Amino acid sequence: RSPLHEAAAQGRLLALKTLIAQGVNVNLVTINRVSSLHEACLGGHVACAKALLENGAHVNGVTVHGATPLFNACCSGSAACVNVLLEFGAKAQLEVHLASPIHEAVKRGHRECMEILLANNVNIDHEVPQLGTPLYVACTYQRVDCVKKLLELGASVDHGQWLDTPLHAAARQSNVEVIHLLTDYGANLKRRNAQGKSALDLAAPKSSVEQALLLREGPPA
């Protein structure tokens, strides 16, 4: 790990540009194949990221753990970083063995980063194995604004993590607004998951979430 890595991690633009000017290797990576660009993006430091990109940093570089600069930018929640990476040719949706930027953005409630990725043609219903769709992640982590936006953009309401629907995920949490939003957008309140459980079955007894499900569930057909 180099001085450039550290300047990038800290968001120390003047030090970073000074080091670049001296001729240090912009693309030097650690044993985990982490570049200075990876560290700038993880810190959400857009000016440092752009300076590195201007000097030939690899916009689609992959760490040993499958992280790209774009994934790291989605960890930080810096929309500015996401934009500059995409400007320099970052791939928005990645192959299966690489960490998914949009799913991390949604998990952390970074709605603007999510919208930018969707605007750059990431599949709104992209189901990462065992993680689920963006809507499923949003429901798992009680990201109300992300849930609302995804539904409005046409996310498949029942598409989650194989048989676990977004409503099943929401039922395990404590957010009532998410329950009504899913229901309003046509969620199937009756269907059962891989454990044979309905959303109502999953809700905590006497909880507000359970109450919401009870109030929205139609009568026996």
Coordinates of C-alpha atoms in Angstrom, one line a residue:
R1 CA 0.0 0.0 0.0
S2 CA 1.4 3.4 -1.1
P3 CA 1.2 7.1 -0.2
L4 CA -1.2 7.5 -3.2
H5 CA -3.6 4.9 -1.7
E6 CA -3.6 6.9 1.6
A7 CA -4.1 10.3 0.0
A8 CA -7.0 8.8 -2.0
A9 CA -8.5 7.1 1.1
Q10 CA -8.4 10.4 3.1
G11 CA -9.7 12.6 0.3
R12 CA -6.5 14.7 0.3
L13 CA -6.7 16.0 -3.2
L14 CA -3.7 18.3 -3.2
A15 CA -1.4 15.6 -1.8
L16 CA -2.9 13.1 -4.3
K17 CA -2.3 15.4 -7.3
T18 CA 1.2 16.3 -6.0
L19 CA 2.1 12.6 -5.9
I20 CA 0.7 12.0 -9.4
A21 CA 2.7 14.9 -10.7
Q22 CA 5.9 13.4 -9.2
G23 CA 5.2 10.3 -11.4
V24 CA 4.0 7.7 -9.0
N25 CA 2.3 4.6 -10.4
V26 CA -1.4 5.4 -10.5
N27 CA -2.4 1.8 -11.1
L28 CA -0.3 0.1 -8.3
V29 CA -2.4 -2.4 -6.4
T30 CA -2.1 -4.1 -3.0
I31 CA -2.0 -7.8 -2.5
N32 CA -5.8 -7.7 -2.4
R33 CA -5.6 -5.9 -5.8
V34 CA -6.9 -2.7 -4.3
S35 CA -6.0 0.4 -6.4
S36 CA -6.0 4.1 -5.2
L37 CA -9.2 4.5 -7.3
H38 CA -10.8 1.8 -5.2
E39 CA -9.9 3.7 -2.0
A40 CA -11.0 7.1 -3.3
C41 CA -14.4 5.7 -4.4
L42 CA -14.9 3.9 -1.1
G43 CA -14.3 7.2 0.7
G44 CA -16.7 9.0 -1.7
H45 CA -13.9 11.4 -2.9
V46 CA -15.0 12.4 -6.4
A47 CA -12.2 14.9 -7.1
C48 CA -9.5 12.4 -6.2
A49 CA -11.3 9.7 -8.2
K50 CA -11.5 12.0 -11.3
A51 CA -7.8 13.0 -11.0
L52 CA -6.9 9.3 -10.9
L53 CA -9.1 8.5 -13.9
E54 CA -7.6 11.4 -15.8
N55 CA -4.2 9.8 -15.3
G56 CA -5.3 6.4 -16.5
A57 CA -6.7 4.6 -13.5
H58 CA -8.6 1.4 -14.4
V59 CA -12.3 2.3 -14.0
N60 CA -13.4 -1.4 -14.0
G61 CA -10.6 -2.8 -11.9
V62 CA -11.6 -5.8 -9.7
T63 CA -10.3 -6.6 -6.2
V64 CA -9.7 -10.1 -4.9
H65 CA -13.1 -9.9 -3.3
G66 CA -14.9 -8.9 -6.5
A67 CA -15.2 -5.2 -5.7
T68 CA -15.1 -2.5 -8.5
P69 CA -14.7 1.2 -8.0
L70 CA -18.4 1.5 -8.8
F71 CA -19.3 -0.9 -6.1
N72 CA -17.2 1.1 -3.6
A73 CA -18.8 4.3 -4.8
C74 CA -22.2 2.8 -3.9
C75 CA -20.8 1.9 -0.5
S76 CA -19.9 5.5 0.1
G77 CA -23.2 6.8 -1.4
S78 CA -21.4 9.5 -3.4
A79 CA -23.6 10.1 -6.5
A80 CA -20.9 12.3 -7.8
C81 CA -18.4 9.4 -7.7
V82 CA -21.0 7.1 -9.4
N83 CA -21.4 9.7 -12.2
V84 CA -17.7 10.3 -12.9
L85 CA -17.1 6.5 -13.0
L86 CA -19.9 6.0 -15.5
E87 CA -18.6 8.9 -17.5
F88 CA -15.2 7.1 -17.7
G89 CA -16.8 3.9 -18.9
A90 CA -17.7 2.0 -15.7
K91 CA -19.9 -1.0 -16.3
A92 CA -23.1 -0.5 -14.4
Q93 CA -24.3 -4.1 -14.1
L94 CA -21.6 -6.8 -13.6
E95 CA -21.2 -10.5 -14.2
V96 CA -22.4 -12.9 -11.4
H97 CA -19.1 -13.3 -9.5
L98 CA -18.7 -9.6 -9.1
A99 CA -20.3 -7.5 -6.3
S100 CA -23.4 -5.8 -7.4
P101 CA -23.4 -2.0 -7.1
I102 CA -27.1 -1.4 -7.1
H103 CA -27.9 -4.0 -4.4
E104 CA -25.3 -2.4 -2.0
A105 CA -26.6 1.1 -2.8
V106 CA -30.2 0.0 -1.9
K107 CA -29.0 -1.8 1.2
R108 CA -27.5 1.4 2.5
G109 CA -30.5 3.5 1.4
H110 CA -28.5 5.5 -1.2
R111 CA -31.5 6.3 -3.4
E112 CA -29.8 8.7 -5.7
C113 CA -27.1 6.2 -6.5
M114 CA -29.8 3.6 -7.2
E115 CA -31.6 5.9 -9.6
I116 CA -28.5 6.8 -11.5
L117 CA -27.7 3.1 -12.0
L118 CA -31.3 2.5 -13.2
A119 CA -31.0 5.4 -15.6
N120 CA -27.9 3.7 -16.9
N121 CA -29.9 0.6 -17.8
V122 CA -29.3 -1.7 -14.8
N123 CA -32.1 -4.3 -14.8
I124 CA -34.6 -3.0 -12.2
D125 CA -35.5 -6.7 -11.5
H126 CA -31.9 -8.0 -11.3
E127 CA -32.0 -10.9 -8.9
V128 CA -28.6 -11.6 -7.5
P129 CA -28.6 -15.2 -6.2
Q130 CA -29.3 -15.4 -2.5
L131 CA -29.5 -11.5 -2.3
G132 CA -32.6 -11.0 -4.3
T133 CA -33.9 -8.1 -6.4
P134 CA -33.3 -4.5 -5.6
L135 CA -36.9 -4.3 -4.3
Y136 CA -36.2 -7.3 -2.0
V137 CA -33.1 -5.7 -0.6
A138 CA -35.0 -2.4 0.0
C139 CA -37.7 -4.2 1.9
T140 CA -35.2 -6.2 4.0
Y141 CA -33.5 -3.0 5.2
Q142 CA -36.7 -0.8 5.5
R143 CA -35.7 1.7 2.8
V144 CA -39.0 3.3 2.4
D145 CA -38.0 5.9 -0.2
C146 CA -36.2 3.2 -2.3
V147 CA -39.2 0.9 -2.1
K148 CA -41.5 3.7 -3.3
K149 CA -39.2 4.7 -6.2
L150 CA -38.6 1.2 -7.3
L151 CA -42.3 0.4 -7.4
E152 CA -43.0 3.7 -9.3
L153 CA -40.4 2.7 -11.9
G154 CA -42.1 -0.6 -12.5
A155 CA -40.2 -3.1 -10.3
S156 CA -41.9 -6.5 -10.2
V157 CA -43.7 -6.4 -6.8
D158 CA -43.5 -10.2 -6.2
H159 CA -40.0 -10.7 -7.5
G160 CA -37.7 -11.2 -4.5
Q161 CA -35.2 -14.0 -3.5
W162 CA -36.5 -17.1 -5.3
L163 CA -39.8 -17.9 -3.4
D164 CA -39.3 -15.2 -0.7
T165 CA -41.2 -12.2 -2.0
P166 CA -40.4 -8.6 -1.0
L167 CA -43.5 -8.8 1.1
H168 CA -42.1 -11.8 3.0
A169 CA -39.0 -9.8 3.7
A170 CA -41.0 -6.8 4.8
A171 CA -43.1 -9.0 7.1
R172 CA -39.9 -9.9 9.0
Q173 CA -39.1 -6.2 9.6
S174 CA -40.8 -3.4 11.5
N175 CA -41.9 -1.0 8.7
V176 CA -45.6 -0.5 8.1
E177 CA -45.3 2.0 5.3
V178 CA -43.5 -0.7 3.2
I179 CA -46.3 -3.2 3.8
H180 CA -48.9 -0.8 2.5
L181 CA -46.8 0.3 -0.5
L182 CA -46.2 -3.3 -1.6
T183 CA -49.9 -4.1 -1.1
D184 CA -50.9 -0.9 -3.0
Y185 CA -48.8 -2.1 -5.9
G186 CA -50.4 -5.5 -6.1
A187 CA -48.4 -7.7 -3.8
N188 CA -49.9 -11.2 -3.3
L189 CA -50.6 -11.4 0.4
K190 CA -51.5 -15.1 0.3
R191 CA -48.6 -16.8 -1.5
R192 CA -46.2 -18.9 0.6
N193 CA -42.4 -19.1 0.5
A194 CA -39.9 -21.9 0.6
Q195 CA -40.7 -22.5 4.3
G196 CA -44.4 -22.7 3.5
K197 CA -45.0 -19.4 5.2
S198 CA -47.2 -16.5 4.1
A199 CA -46.2 -12.9 4.9
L200 CA -48.8 -12.9 7.7
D201 CA -47.2 -16.1 9.2
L202 CA -43.8 -14.3 9.3
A203 CA -45.1 -11.1 11.1
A204 CA -44.4 -10.8 14.8
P205 CA -47.5 -11.4 16.9
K206 CA -49.4 -8.3 18.0
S207 CA -47.0 -6.1 16.0
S208 CA -47.9 -3.1 13.8
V209 CA -46.6 -5.0 10.8
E210 CA -48.9 -7.9 11.6
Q211 CA -51.8 -5.5 12.0
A212 CA -51.1 -4.0 8.6
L213 CA -51.1 -7.4 6.9
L214 CA -54.4 -8.3 8.7
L215 CA -56.0 -5.1 7.6
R216 CA -55.1 -5.6 3.9
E217 CA -55.7 -9.3 3.6
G218 CA -58.8 -10.0 1.6
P219 CA -61.5 -12.5 2.8
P220 CA -61.4 -16.2 1.9
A221 CA -61.9 -16.7 -1.8

